[PDB]
């Protein structure tokens, strides 16, 4: 019980010794075709279960279409965590990535 | 798989290892001892292979958990082998170490210094230190010098691992890449070659009798040759301060060798550092008990109307009979005074015992490796053992894991249609009415789903059932229009239960033009032979309709070829 | 050489003054890994409270080894290790398969963790010839079985009477024999010898 | 016998300390028998067995003792026992749940289930629930789920349903807190009846069922919420809880009348009940968020309510409606150009919805909107015309029967004109759900026998 | 040959790190390449 | 299309054994909808339309003290064409045990048919 | 019963429990009760009864 | 979807402690108590545990036969293909043990 605490502190400490700083990011500033699809699907999933929606529905009933709309206006509150092959990662907000 | 039943725990790695007879006995739900499986009223025989502690069977409830044939996961039991048997899977490796042993000083017959040089190298390779393992060989400055050599090689390995850990070259979990794995495998091969290459023991100078085998896992010991018996008694003063050989003798020999040569074995048997700190034991190559798999995995078959016994049971009952029979040999053994018994009956009792052990050991061998069993009653054709079950045809892995039967997907002859879009697929109503996609009910779709439920199972676009917040399903099949209208009006009622409050109902609505399916024509040799098409339901059609612009991709001819639709 | 002995009570405990009872109320900091439902994405603390913490209140919890009375200072651990413990914008990793999040949290629990041997006081609410029934802190059930009451104590029709012939009432002081915890509610087995 | 049996058990218990367990089991089996079998342990011997067990309950708190105990908790129709014997059973249960408060869970479940029995046959069950809820407040948890578990289904016998509510009411009267789960059950069940009645619109059954249930609920409410009870009581709290629950269940779900009346009716008992509940509806109406369908449903409720109620102030009602209409002037100003801008007149469903409700309210309460002078409250003469000629052209987009009736009445009252605007309209001449939603009026007249009579004081029939 | 390699894995006391497509299909883990190349996190206020 | 199926309830019996199952109806209680497809002998009336699940045969089983029913298995509905009673030789005495039922299946030409 | 929706996947104490004075128990009960004002309602009601007893009352 | 979800995909119990998916079972509880999920490998027969401090009530469980156990309560559920269970079962017949490392610990 005392030592699980220790175990957690070690996990959390190392995890904070890998994540690369924002001002030190080095991957593509473009959203990848993969990132786009998953962002849409996942945000669509959250919409289907009553996530607060950041845009006017204007009659839309397809949650994927709602997501697409949100994406278009850059109102999707999701962040992509990109993993380099050593397990360290860069966090990129959906709004900051160039979409095409 | 249900998006409303999330899982928090996640498997992150798998470790391979060996079940000890202690573990098995502890976890076991029942020790099985009766060859007979059923009684005259078709109930499980107690202590038999369908014993209810191993799980629910037919209309009986599991005696271990109490659940029925549907919710009971099954439980394993064990058979007690009255005499140790070689585990057929690891019989070749056992053979290598046995042959390599010195039956006198109980080290490997390879000189200790060399064995230590291998232990050093393999240990370095656990940390991926390939350069260092070659540098280890660069170390040199008769038994006094050797221990200093051993010692300085040892302090090099420690210094190298320490240094490697301090900088960024390894963790305590090791480092394991292909180039490392290649160097490791070579060394172990080289090591084994050198083990078997020695005659006289480099360490005590004696000769051990040579060991020979079968393809059916029996071990013979060839007694000593003339020059060699002479050589052995000359070394007689310094030490002062053919035949079948039982699996129990073999185990005793290896037990001691594994104690003495533990250091090297600690790295030969671990590609990573052994954090667990478990000893490497000889028992790992042997087995005193057999795990009886759950019952649910040992049921009879029906070939149409006739019922056939389970083949794994046929094999296990042969273990059972031999077992009872040996327990009787063992009873008459000490059940007859030596005084009255004879060097004459002593020989015959042994003869009968050897016979029993050999044939039970054969029946066990034949299972996990039928290719090691003696062909039965010349005819019949062998019954598959576990090896053959996993390797039947393309094998379990390829036939039921890398590929599987699917569901919901449909198949039909395709027909051409110039009037659908090049990205659509014309779906016959016969499909459109049977396919399910779940819908969760929300403010934005309550109008739509109300109508679907009202429409019912048989009027498109309708619905076949409703999932409630407590996961339960309600069929719309037997229902009148009024009953459906009722259910449609309670689709969006609040929660009367805190535990399900985060969920909404789901309507299992019929196909819809809004939908996407996956179309497939075999052989699928590139990814364009499996594409996503938008659904277009077409009245009165009995086949799938596909625009010509897609023939190229699918390599489709419209000559009665078929496609699969996946939803 | 073998340690299953890592189920040994590492929360000792004493008595009191100006008094004589034990104090079993304790404050323990915990970490807990919990799910966050999509409906709470704008109210994550609210959601952690309604989903996980609230259901712990006034139930025994195997990990803190007592009854949880309540909680203070809930904090979500940002999955972004680069942010300040300050900010009110945090990251919660979403399941691959589902829309649910899972985050670590820190919170403080107040726990009633009584242990065999302790001295407690109860308010008598029932007296049969078979047991005396008490209520500790006017909340938790206690019970002294007929033969944990000293031998010279007598009964009538009813109500108990002590060593000196005078009836007992209200506050009674007893020692903990066993704590039953598996039933609907906690119940203490107490003794007077 | 008398003393022989005292021995038999006293032996049985000795034998139990030795684990033989046979004697006990013989006894248990004897008590477990059905109320019908003559061979079930008789009163006198049971008197004995009980008083002996109560005297040292600790002798039994063992795995060996479990079966005996289970057999006494499961004693058929114990409430049908005798006085003296009944008393020993009660004392035993009391004693039992004291030490190992583990059997109270089993005892209370059976108790609640007996709530389907008359107003009398449960006294003992409630007496016991009241007692142990107090001494074991932690129990409220699982015993609440019992309230769920044992509710009778709508299909199940009426006597079962009518009983299980009779008991819940009795329970309410000694465990005020538990309240919510109960109210959730009643609400959940009444919605079932309302919904089904609509869809269906055996049936003779649901009528008298749903009738027996509502008439009960409302009479209890006529009592329970009372001015005395509102100042110092839990009538006010009950009212608030009820209102919230009611709105939420009613607030949402689609197209059915048979329960929403409960609120129509309790409301009009006292002026404040009308007031505060009505203000809650106003809070609902004009929240920015709310489903384009929630705001429209409320507005239908709002309009139907004002029209039909009976315990109204003319004036508390009308002024708020006038303010909403001024709310109207703003809507059109911050939106017609939103009208001559890109989109359709559907963008304004919600506007018409509210304007309908207000027009409808004016039809039924017109004769009221003329003050002493003969002038119009809220300048209805000048106001209606302005909307009618606006760019929204309400007359074209609102209902097909209210707009007509408003025309008739408004024209009659020199309040506003319209037959030429109608002519122009049909000359110039997801859309369905809207037409559907605009056709439903949650406070159009009720059906059925008693409730109707009870509502009369609170209702204006068209006549 | 399944049992041979299994035999090799056991005698090495190997850990399957579950990184290959085959291994992940065996254990039911989402594939690496492609989708399995990034994480998703939720931005939460307050 | 025509399909002939052979129903032979001597399939189980161990060679010239006592006969358990006889074509016809027993006196226990059985559906009655059965007589829509089946004549008194337990054989189907010629001409009858028969779709998946319908009875094509009824016999009384002695070991069951019940009247049972062989059902029609194709997912394609058909009509009964010929019902042949295949009696046995070895000189009479033996009662009915073997029957051949010939089904007639309509084939209007369809989309996907080859010419 | 218990699912991933209403139950933590795992719980761990990060320190040894620290005993608290009566004055502290009272200050905590105070605020916890206030902040939380259907199942939770009937529960803080019961907690309110327990804090009453701690202070000696009815 | 197609090689897991739209096919099998059925939660299973693991012991976080020994990493098995074959040695768990539902406890059989006394009437009134609720069933829990326990590991037959990681728990002691009740007798043997007494024979080596006081033992908490939540730490004892029983099977259908009636034997009492101490410990083995470190279980969860993971999502695996069913055929994995079959493979693990066959492997244990051959004396081979798979050990799944589950997180969070
Ligand atoms: Zn089972
Ligand atoms: Zn030697
Ligand atoms: Zn385990």
Are the CB atoms for D173 and D229 separated by under 8 Å?
no
Provide the sign of the torsion angle of the four alpha carbons B373, B377, B379, B385, taken in this order: negative
List the beta bridge partners of residue B38.
B44
d(CA C7, CA H47) in angstroms, rounded, equals 18
Our CA angle for C22, H60, B7, nearest 5°, is 100
Where in the sequence is the domain holding C75, given as residue range(s)?
25-112
Tokens of C88: 């009110």
Residue whose C-alpha is closest to residue D388's, from D346, D348, D419, D345 = D419
Which residues fall within 8 angstroms of residue B277, CB to CB, at 6 or more apart? none
Secondary structure class of G25 (helix, strand, coil): helix
Where in the sequence is the domain holding F84, given as residue range(s)?
1-108
Are the CB atoms for H4 and B1 separated by under 8 Å?
yes
The H-or-E segment that residue A4 falls in is helix A2-15
Provide the sign of the torsion angle of the four alpha carbons D223, D225, D227, D228, taken in this order: positive
Secondary structure class of B537 (helix, strand, coil): strand
Burial group, residue D101, by CB count within 10 angstroms (0-12, 13-18, 19+)? buried
Chain A residues interacting with chain B (CB cutoff of 8 angstroms):
45, 48-50, 57, 60-63
CB-based contact, D181 to chain G, within 8 Å: yes
Are the CB atoms for B511 and B432 separated by under 8 Å?
yes
Which residues fall within 8 angstroms of residue B401, CB to CB, at 6 or more apart? E25, E26, H81, H83, H87
How near does any CA of chain E get to the CA of B270, in Å? 5
Separation of A35 CA from ligand 3 center, angstroms? 39
Burial group, residue D321, by CB count within 10 angstroms (0-12, 13-18, 19+)? buried
**Which site among A51, A77, A90 would you substitute to test the E interface, given the most E Cβ atoms closer than 10 Å to its Cβ?**
A77
Burial group, residue B549, by CB count within 10 angstroms (0-12, 13-18, 19+)? exposed
Secondary structure class of E39 (helix, strand, coil): strand
- Cβ C131–D139 below 8 Å, yes or no? no
For B72-174, where are the alpha helices, taking DSSP H only? Answer: 92-100, 112-126, 130-135, 143-166
Strands (E), B279-423: 286-292, 301-303, 306-308, 410-416
Considering only CA atoms, give the Rg of chain G.
15
Q: What is each CA distance from C156 to C34, C128, C162, C190, D90, in whole angstroms?
A: 55, 9, 11, 21, 18
Tell whether B557 is in a known binding site: yes
Q: What is the resolution of this structure in A?
A: 4.8
For B338-445, where are the alpha helices, taking DSSP H only? Answer: 343-368, 386-391, 396-400, 429-432
- Residue written as token pair 């058929």: D76
d(CA F101, CA A10) in angstroms, rounded, equals 79
How near does any CA of chain D get to the CA of C89, in Å? 23
Residue whose C-alpha is closest to residue G20's, from C69, C53, C178 = C69
Where in the sequence is the domain holding A59, given as residue range(s)?
15-100
B408-434+512-567 domain in CATH 3.40.718.10? no
Backbone angles phi, psi at B301, to 5 degrees: -120, 150
Q: Residue D72: how many CB atoms within 10 A of its CB?
A: 21
Are the CB atoms for C148 and C192 separated by under 8 Å?
yes
Separation of B28 CA from ligand 3 center, angstroms? 13
- Cβ B391–E1 below 8 Å, yes or no? yes
CA atoms within 13 A on the CB side of B486: 17
On whether residue A5 sits in a domain, the answer given is no
List the beta bridge partners of residue C36.
C101
- Residue written as token pair 């909403």: D324
On whether residue A71 sits in a domain, the answer given is yes
- Residue written as token pair 């028992």: B283
Tell whether B120 is in a known binding site: no
d(CA D380, CA D415) in angstroms, rounded, equals 6
- Cβ H58–C180 below 8 Å, yes or no? no
The count of structural domains within chain A is 1
Q: At what angle do helices B247-260 and B92-100 cross, to 10 degrees?
A: 70
Our CA angle for B135, B139, B145, nearest 5°, is 160
- Residue written as token pair 């003329």: D370
What is the number of residues in chain E? 46
As a three-state string, the secondary structure of chain D is CHHHHHHHHHHHHHHHHCCCCHHHHHHHHHHHCCCCCCCCCCHHHHHHHHHHHHHCHHHCCCCCCHHHHHHHHCCCCHHHCCHHHHHHHHHHHHHHHHHCCCCHHHHHHHHHHHHHCCCCCCHHHHHHHHHHHHHCHHHHHHHHHHHHHCCCCCCCCHHHHHHHHHHHHHHHCCCCCCCHHHHHHHHHHHHHHHHHHHHCCCCHHHHHHHHHHHHHHHHHHHHHCCHHHHHCCCHHHHHHHHHHHHHHHHCCCCCCCCCHHHHHHHHCCCHHHHHHHHHHHHHHHCCCCCCHHHHHHHHHHHHHHHHHCCCCCHHHHHHHHHHHHHHHHHHHHCCCCCCCCCCCHHHHHHHHHHHHHHHHHHHHHHHHCECCCCCEHHHHHHHHHHHHCCCCCHHHHCCCCHHHHHHHHHHHCCCCCCHHHHHHHHHCCCHHHHHHHCCCCCCCCCCCHHHHHHHHHHCCCCC
- Residue written as token pair 């059985």: F30
Residue in chain B closest to D200 (alpha carbons) equals B482
- Cβ G46–D180 below 8 Å, yes or no? no
Separation of D307 CA from ligand 1 center, angstroms? 65
Contacts 24+ apart (CB under 8 A), C74-79: C74/C45, C74/C48, C74/C49, C74/C105, C74/C106, C74/C107, C75/C105, C75/C106, C75/C107, C76/C44, C76/C45, C76/C48, C76/C103, C76/C104, C76/C105, C76/E44, C77/A12, C77/C103, C77/C104, C77/C105, C77/C106, C79/C103, C79/E41
**Which site among D138, D177, D183, D242 would you substitute to test the G interface, given the most G Cβ atoms closer than 10 Å to its Cβ?**
D177
Are the CB atoms for F44 and F83 separated by under 8 Å?
yes
The H-or-E segment that residue B532 falls in is strand B530-537
Backbone angles phi, psi at G15, to 5 degrees: -140, 170
Tell whether B102 is in a known binding site: yes
List the beta bridge partners of residue H13.
H77
Cis previous bond, C18, omega within 30: yes
List the beta bridge partners of residue B474.
B466
Show me where the domains of chain B are located: 13-86+284-407, 87-283, 408-434+512-567, 435-511
**Which site among D63, D98, D128, D135 would you substitute to test the C interface, given the most C Cβ atoms closer than 10 Å to its Cβ?**
D98
Are the CB atoms for B362 and B373 separated by under 8 Å?
yes
CA atoms within 13 A on the CB side of B130: 12
d(CA H87, CA B396) in angstroms, rounded, equals 9
The string of DSSP codes covering B166-214 is HTTT--TT----HHHHHHHHHHHHHHHHHHHT-SS-TTT---PPEEEE-
d(CA D193, CA D209) in angstroms, rounded, equals 9
List the beta bridge partners of residue C25.
C112
Residue in chain C closest to B4 (alpha carbons) equals C98
Secondary structure class of C149 (helix, strand, coil): coil
Are the CB atoms for F84 and B385 separated by under 8 Å?
no
Backbone angles phi, psi at G10, to 5 degrees: -155, 150
The count of structural domains within chain F is 1
Q: Residue D400: how many CB atoms within 10 A of its CB?
A: 9
Backbone angles phi, psi at C116, to 5 degrees: -45, 130
Of E3, E10, E27, the CB nearest to H80: E27
Separation of B66 CA from ligand 1 center, angstroms? 6
d(CA D403, CA D393) in angstroms, rounded, equals 12
Are the CB atoms for D50 and D92 separated by under 8 Å?
yes
The count of structural domains within chain D is 1
CATH code for the domain of F58: 2.40.50.150
Question: How many angstroms from the chain centroid is the CA of residue C99?
Answer: 34
Burial group, residue C23, by CB count within 10 angstroms (0-12, 13-18, 19+)? middle
On whether residue A22 sits in a domain, the answer given is yes
d(CA D265, CA D455) in angstroms, rounded, equals 6
Pairing mode, strands F66-71 and F21-23: unpaired
The H-or-E segment that residue B466 falls in is strand B463-467
On whether residue A10 sits in a domain, the answer given is no
Q: At what angle do helices D292-308 and D260-267 cross, to 10 degrees?
A: 40
The H-or-E segment that residue B11 falls in is strand B10-18
Burial group, residue F109, by CB count within 10 angstroms (0-12, 13-18, 19+)? exposed
d(CA B325, CA C111) in angstroms, rounded, equals 62
d(CA B504, CA B470) in angstroms, rounded, equals 9
Tokens of D8: 């038999």
Contacts of H105 in chain G (CB under 8 A): 10
Q: How far apart are the first and last CA of chain C?
A: 39
Phi-psi label, residue B34: left if phi above 0, alpha if psi -120 to 50, beta otherwise: beta
Tokens of B21: 């007879």
Residue whose C-alpha is closest to residue B156's, from B190, B131, B185 = B131
CA atoms within 13 A on the CB side of H100: 31
Are the CB atoms for H37 and H14 separated by under 8 Å?
no
Neighbours of chain D (3+ CB pairs under 8 A): B, C, G, H
Contacts of H34 in chain G (CB under 8 A): 1
CATH number for the domain running over B435-511: 3.30.1490.180
- Cβ H32–D66 below 8 Å, yes or no? no
Where in the sequence is the domain holding D32, given as residue range(s)?
1-463
Domain H1-104: top CATH class: alpha beta
How near does any CA of chain A get to the CA of B517, in Å? 16
In chain C, residues preceding a discontinuity (C to N beyond 2.5 A) are: 157
d(CA B155, CA B166) in angstroms, rounded, equals 17
Q: Residue D413: how many CB atoms within 10 A of its CB?
A: 17
- Cβ B504–A50 below 8 Å, yes or no? yes
d(CA D276, CA D278) in angstroms, rounded, equals 5
d(CA B115, CA B273) in angstroms, rounded, equals 19
Q: What is each CA distance from A73 to A78, A97, B358, in whole angstroms?
A: 13, 13, 78
Q: At what angle do helices B178-196 and B112-126 cross, to 10 degrees?
A: 170
Experimentally determined by: cryo-EM
The H-or-E segment that residue F82 falls in is strand F78-86
Secondary structure class of B495 (helix, strand, coil): coil
């Amino acid at each position: 019980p005392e030592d699980f605490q220790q175990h957690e502190q070690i996990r959390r400490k190392t995890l904070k010794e890998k994540a690369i700083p924002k001002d030190q990011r080095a991957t593509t500033p473009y959203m990848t075709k993969y990132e786009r699809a998953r962002i849409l699907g996942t945000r669509a999933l959250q919409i289907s279960m009553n996530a607060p929606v950041f845009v006017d529905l204007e009659g839309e009933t397809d949650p994927l279409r709602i997501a697409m709309k949100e994406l278009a206006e850059k109102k999707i509150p999701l962040v992509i965590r990109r993993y380099l092959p050593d397990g360290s990662f860069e966090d990129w907000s959906v709004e900051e990535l160039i979409v095409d | 798989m249900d998006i409303s039943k999330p899982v928090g725990s996640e498997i992150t790695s798998v470790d391979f290892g060996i079940l000890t007879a202690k573990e098995i006995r502890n976890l076991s739900a029942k020790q099985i001892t009766n060859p007979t499986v059923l009684d005259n009223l078709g109930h499980p025989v107690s202590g038999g292979l369908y014993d209810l502690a191993l799980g629910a069977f037919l209309r009986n409830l599991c005696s271990t958990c109490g659940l029925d044939e549907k919710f009971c996961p099954g439980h394993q039991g064990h058979i007690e082998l009255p005499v140790p048997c070689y585990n057929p899977l690891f019989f070749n490796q056992l053979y290598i170490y046995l042959r390599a042993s010195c039956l006198f000083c109980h080290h490997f017959r390879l000189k200790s210094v060399e064995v230590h040089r291998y232990a050093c190298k393999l240990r370095l390779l656990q940390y991926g230190l390939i350069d260092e393992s070659y540098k280890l060989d660069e170390i040199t400055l008769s038994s006094t010098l050797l221990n200093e050599l051993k010692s300085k090689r040892s302090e090099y390995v420690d210094m190298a691992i320490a240094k490697a850990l301090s900088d960024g070259r390894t963790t305590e979990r090791g480092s394991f890449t292909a180039t490392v794995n290649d160097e490791r495998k070579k060394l172990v091969h080289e090591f084994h070659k050198k083990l078997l290459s020695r005659g006289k023991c480099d360490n005590c100078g004696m000769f051990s009798p040579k060991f020979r085998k079968d393809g059916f896992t029996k071990i013979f010991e060839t007694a000593l040759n003339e020059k060699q018996i002479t050589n052995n008694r000359v070394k007689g003063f310094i030490r002062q301060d053919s035949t079948y050989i039982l699996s129990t003798e073999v185990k005793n020999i290896l037990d001691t060798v594994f104690r003495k040569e533990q250091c090297v074995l600690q790295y030969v048997f671990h590609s990573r550092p052994n954090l667990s700190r478990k000893l490497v034991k000889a028992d790992s190559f042997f087995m005193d008990v057999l795990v009886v798999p759950p019952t649910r995995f040992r049921l009879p078959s029906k070939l149409g109307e006739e019922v056939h016994e389970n083949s794994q049971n046929q094999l296990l009952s042969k273990v059972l009979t031999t077992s009872l029979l040996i327990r009787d040999l063992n009873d008459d053994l000490s059940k007859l005074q030596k005084d009255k018994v004879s060097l004459e009956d002593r020989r015959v009792i042994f003869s009968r015992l050897m016979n029993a052990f050999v044939t039970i050991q054969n029946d066990v061998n034949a299972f996990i490796d039928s290719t090691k069993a003696q062909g039965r009653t010349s005819g019949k054709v062998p019954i598959p053992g576990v090896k053959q079950a996993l390797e039947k045809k393309e094998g379990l892995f390829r036939k039921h894991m890398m590929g599987k039967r699917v569901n919901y997907a449909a198949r039909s002859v395709i027909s051409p249609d110039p009037n659908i879009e090049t990205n659509e697929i014309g779906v016959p109503p016969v499909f459109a009415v049977k396919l399910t996609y779940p819908e969760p009910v929300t403010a934005y779709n309550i109008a739509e789903l109300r109508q679907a439920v009202i429409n019912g199972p048989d009027k498109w676009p309708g619905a076949t059932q409703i999932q409630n917040e407590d996961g339960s399903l309600v069929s719309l099949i037997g229902m009148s229009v009024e009953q459906r209208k009722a259910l449609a009006n309670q689709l969006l009622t609040p929660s009367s239960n805190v535990s399900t409050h985060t969920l909404n109902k789901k309507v299992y609505r019929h196909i819809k033009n809004r939908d996407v399916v996956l179309m497939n024509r075999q052989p699928t040799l590139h990814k364009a032979s499996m594409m996503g098409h938008k659904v277009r339901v077409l009245p009165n059609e009995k086949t799938l309709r596909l625009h010509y612009a897609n023939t190229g991709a699918y390599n489709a001819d419209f000559d009665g070829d078929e496609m699969n639709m996946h939803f | 050489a073998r340690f299953i002995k890592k189920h040994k009570k590492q929360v000792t405990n004493p008595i009191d003054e100006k008094n004589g009872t034990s104090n079993c109320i304790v404050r323990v900091p915990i970490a807990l890994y919990v799910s966050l439902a999509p409906m709470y994405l704008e109210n994550p603390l609210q959601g952690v409270m309604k989903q996980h913490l609230n259901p712990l209140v006034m139930k025994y919890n195997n990990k803190v080894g007592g009854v949880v009375l309540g909680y203070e200072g809930l904090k979500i651990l940002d999955a972004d290790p680069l942010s300040k413990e300050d900010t009110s914008e945090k990251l919660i990793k979403i399941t691959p398969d589902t829309p649910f999040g899972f985050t670590w949290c820190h919170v403080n629990l107040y726990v009633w963790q009584p242990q065999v041997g302790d001295v407690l006081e109860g308010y008598i609410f029932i007296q049969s010839a078979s047991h005396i029934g008490l209520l500790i802190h006017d909340a938790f059930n206690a019970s002294i079985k007929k033969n944990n009451i000293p031998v010279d104590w007598t009964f009538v029709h009813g109500h108990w009477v002590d060593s000196n012939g005078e009836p007992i009432d209200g506050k009674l002081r007893f020692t903990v024999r066993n704590v039953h915890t598996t039933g609907r509610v906690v119940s203490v087995d107490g003794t007077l010898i | 016998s008398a003393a022989m049996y005292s021995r038999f058990v006293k032996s049985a218990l000795d034998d139990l300390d030795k684990n033989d367990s046979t004697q006990i089991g013989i006894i248990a089996n004897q008590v477990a028998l059905p109320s019908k079998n003559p061979e079930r342990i008789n009163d006198k011997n049971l008197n004995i067995l009980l008083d002996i067990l109560s005297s040292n309950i600790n002798r039994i708190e063992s795995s060996r003792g479990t079966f005996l105990i289970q057999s006494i908790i499961n004693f058929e129709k114990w409430w049908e026992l005798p006085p003296h014997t009944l008393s020993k059973y009660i004392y035993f249960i009391k004693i039992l749940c004291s030490s190992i408060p583990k059997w109270w869970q089993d005892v209370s479940m059976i108790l609640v289930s007996c709530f389907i029995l008359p107003i009398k046959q449960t006294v003992c069950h409630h007496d016991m629930l009241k007692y142990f809820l107090r001494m074991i407040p932690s129990s409220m948890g699982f015993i609440d789920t019992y309230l769920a578990k044992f509710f009778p289904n709508k299909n199940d016998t009426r006597r079962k349903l009518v009983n299980y509510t009779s008991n819940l009411l009795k329970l309410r009267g000694y465990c005020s807190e538990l309240g919510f789960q109960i109210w959730s059950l009643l609400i959940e069940k009444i919605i079932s009846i309302d919904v089904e009645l609509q869809n269906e619109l055996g049936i003779k059954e649901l009528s008298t069922k749903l009738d027996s249930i509502l008439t009960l609920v409302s009479t209890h409410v006529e009592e329970q919420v009372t001015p005395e009870s509102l100042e110092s009581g839990e009538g006010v709290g009950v009212f608030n809880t009820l209102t919230t629950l009611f709105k939420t269940h009613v607030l949402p779900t689609y197209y059915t009348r048979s329960i929403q009346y409960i609120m129509f009716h309790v409301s009009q008992q006292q002026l404040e009940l009308m007031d505060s509940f009505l203000v809650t509806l106003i809070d609902i109406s004009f929240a920015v968020n709310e489903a384009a369908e929630k705001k429209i449903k409320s507005l239908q409720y709002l309009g139907s309510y004002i029209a039909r109620a009976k315990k109204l102030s003319r004036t508390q009602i009308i002024f708020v409606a006038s303010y909403l209409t001024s709310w109207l002037n703003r809507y059109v100003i911050e939106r017609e150009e939103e009208v001559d801008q890109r989109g359709g007149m559907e963008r304004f469903k919600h506007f018409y919805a509210a304007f309908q409700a207000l027009c409808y309210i004016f039809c039924f309460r017109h004769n009221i909107f003329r003050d002493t002078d003969g002038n119009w409250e809220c300048e209805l003469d000048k106001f209606f015309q302005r909307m009618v000629i606006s760019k929204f052209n309400p007359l074209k987009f609102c209902n097909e029967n209210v707009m007509l009736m408003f025309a008739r009445i408004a024209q009659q009252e020199s309040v506003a004109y319209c037959f030429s605007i109608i002519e122009n309209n049909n000359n110039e001449r997801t859309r369905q759900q809207f037409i559907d939603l605009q056709s439903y009026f949650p406070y159009d007249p009720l059906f059925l026998k008693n409730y109707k009579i009870l509502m009369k004081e609170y209702y204006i029939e068209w006549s | 040959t399944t049992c041979q390699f299994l035999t090799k894995a056991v005698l090495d006391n190997e850990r399957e790190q579950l990184d290959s497509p085959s291994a992940r299909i065996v254990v039911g883990k989402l594939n690496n390449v492609g989708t399995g190349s990034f994480d998703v996190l939720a931005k939460v206020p307050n | 299309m025509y399909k002939t199926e052979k129903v032979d309830l001597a399939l189980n019996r161990n060679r010239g054994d006592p006969i358990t199952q006889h074509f016809g109806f027993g006196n226990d209680e059985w559906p009655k909808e059965w007589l829509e497809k089946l004549d008194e002998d337990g054989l189907p009336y010629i001409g009858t339309y028969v779709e998946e699940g319908d009875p094509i045969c009824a016999y009384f089983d002695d070991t069951l003290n019940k009247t049972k029913i062989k059902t029609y298995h194709s997912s394609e509905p058909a009509y009964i064409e010929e019902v042949n009673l295949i009696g046995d030789e070895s000189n009479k005495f033996q009662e009915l045990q073997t029957v051949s039922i010939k089904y007639r299946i309509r084939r209007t030409p369809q989309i996907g048919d080859k010419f | 019963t218990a699912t991933t929706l209403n139950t933590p996947v795992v719980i761990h104490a990060t320190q040894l429990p620290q005993h608290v004075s009566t004055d502290e128990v009272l200050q905590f009960l105070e605020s916890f009760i206030d902040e939380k004002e259907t199942n939770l309602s009937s529960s803080i009601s019961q907690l309110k009864r327990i804090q009453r007893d701690f202070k000696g009352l009815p | 979807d197609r090689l897991l979800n739209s096919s099998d995909y059925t939660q299973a119990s693991v012991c976080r402690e020994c990493g098995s998916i074959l040695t768990t079972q539902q406890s059989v509880p006394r009437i009134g108590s609720i069933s829990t999920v326990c590991c037959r490998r990681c728990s002691m027969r009740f007798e043997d545990a007494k024979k080596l401090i006081f033992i908490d009530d939540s730490q004892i469980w029983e099977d259908g036969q009636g034997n009492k156990f101490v410990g083995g309560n470190e279980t969860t559920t993971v999502a695996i293909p069913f055929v994995l269970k079959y493979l693990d079962s066959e492997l244990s017949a051959m004396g081979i043990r798979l050990r799944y490392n589950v997180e969070p610990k």
